[PDB]
């Protein structure tokens, strides 16, 4: 460590403390259940907004984990809001599994059952479990893994969508061009990052193997090798549907399958994926860094600079992470970098809000809500966990 880590490690569990945690504790919906669904550029709360599961999942996920760290008694009772509501409306009691999303009352809007929406369920509920002790979350997360592997599970990943009943149908996401993506790095990413979070709790023998095949998975199948990228959306057999990158998903996978790597029990793949990691974040840095943060995507030729949220904070643990396993100097620069960044452009200087969505390429804000099914507490809430953990 060294006197600029400890006081950056400082400065983010000041920002997740006084910033991050009080926000989203105001979005508590008392009439209903869960958190209200939506909030607007201008700070307006739309309390009849729809209720996205993968929303409420990163809710449960983030204070539970705000809990685990911190233990802030009140971060575990809004834990204990988020599962509830995940518990009473999105599980689907007849045919098991989460709904995609439910009206602000809790009435069930989409019951189709996607792979994406399953995974952080169980990253939520291994979390909360943790967290409380509540057997019933455990009960839950194991029985969408359960599900998972005998329901969606093919020979070269899993489908990703189905009917309410487990019926496979054609997934909800597309190309650029409208064109359907069979498979798709993100859905994989986030079963991964689950499986590693359910396996970090259990010790389960099943979920020590679903764990590495995932890795093998984005070793063999989706890494693109020695490019420093993964493939994005893809045909059912894993061939690009478009030459794209996503710096994002690529930085947050670096540290996911470091991450995962640690539980591996095989030696020759447990190095692989080590060396693999370490490539994504070098080649990150010297294409996608830009000196003061990362850029978003590109698609062919086309680059999009914008600059996301998201994407930004999982750059920051993403070049931490490759500064602990390296001593170069040069990654903990950038992730400090992208901190400072994050701090002087997309932290909303408005009260009663938190970060921006995006700023475009020169640096101006940009109309976009604060909350919304996509825009949650869990990237930057994680980002600011950490360092918090990582920093002794």
């Known amino acids: 460590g060294s006197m600029d880590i400890t006081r950056f490690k400082e400065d983010l569990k000041a920002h997740l403390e006084e910033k991050i945690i009080p926000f989203w504790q105001s979005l508590k919906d008392d009439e209903f259940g869960g958190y209200y669904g939506y909030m607007d550029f201008n700070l307006n709360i739309d309390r009849k907004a729809q209720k996205g599961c993968i929303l409420n999942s990163r809710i449960l996920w983030f204070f539970s984990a705000c809990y685990n760290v911190l233990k802030s008694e009140k971060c575990k009772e809004m834990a204990f809001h988020a599962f509830e509501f995940l518990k009473n409306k ?15 009352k809790g009435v069930p809007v989409d019951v189709t059952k996607h792979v994406y929406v399953q995974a952080f369920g169980i990253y939520g509920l291994s979390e909360y479990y943790e967290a409380s002790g ?6 839950m997360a194991k029985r969408l893994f359960e599900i998972l ?24 996401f597309l190309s650029e061009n409208g064109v359907i993506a069979s498979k798709t790095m993100n859905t994989h990413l986030h079963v991964l990052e ?20 995932i890795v093998r998975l984005f070793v063999d199948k989706i890494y693109k090798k020695g490019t420093g990228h993964f493939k994005v959306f893809c045909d059912d057999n894993w061939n690009e549907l478009i030459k794209a990158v996503s710096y994002g998903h690529d930085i947050e996978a670096s540290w996911l399958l470091d991450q995962a790597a640690k539980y591996l029990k095989d030696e ?20 996608a860094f830009d000196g003061q943060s990362l850029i978003n995507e590109m698609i062919e030729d086309r680059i999009d600079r914008s600059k996301i949220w998201w994407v930004e904070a999982e750059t ?22 992208t901190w400072e960044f994050i701090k002087e452009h997309l932290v909303d200087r408005r009260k009663n809000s938190e970060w921006l969505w995006k700023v475009n390429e020169d640096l101006e804000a940009v109309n976009m809500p604060i ?22």
Not at 90 to 104: A, M, N, P, R, T
Not at 195 to 202: A, E, V
Not at 268 to 287: R, S
């Open 90 to 104: 999105f599980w689907d009691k007849e045919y098991e599994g989460l709904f995609w999303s439910v009206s602000h």
């Open 149 to 172: 592997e005998t329901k969606c599970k093919r020979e070269n990943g899993y489908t990703e969508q189905f009917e309410r009943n487990w019926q496979e149908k054609e997934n909800r």
């Open 268 to 287: 020759k793949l447990k190095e692989e994926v080590e060396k693999l990691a370490l490539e994504v974040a070098q080649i990150t840095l010297k294409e």
């Open 134 to 139: 509540d057997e019933e979350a455990l009960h």
């Open 194 to 213: 689950s499986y590693t979070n359910l396996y970090r709790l259990l010790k389960l023998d099943d979920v020590y193997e679903a764990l590495e095949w």
């Open 316 to 337: 920051v643990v993403g070049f931490f992470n490759a500064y602990q396993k390296t001593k170069e100097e040069k990654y903990l620069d950038a992730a400090i970098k």
């Open 371 to 392: 909350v919304e099914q996509w825009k949650c507490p869990y990237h930057n809430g994680r980002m600011c966990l950490e360092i918090i953990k990582r920093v002794d």
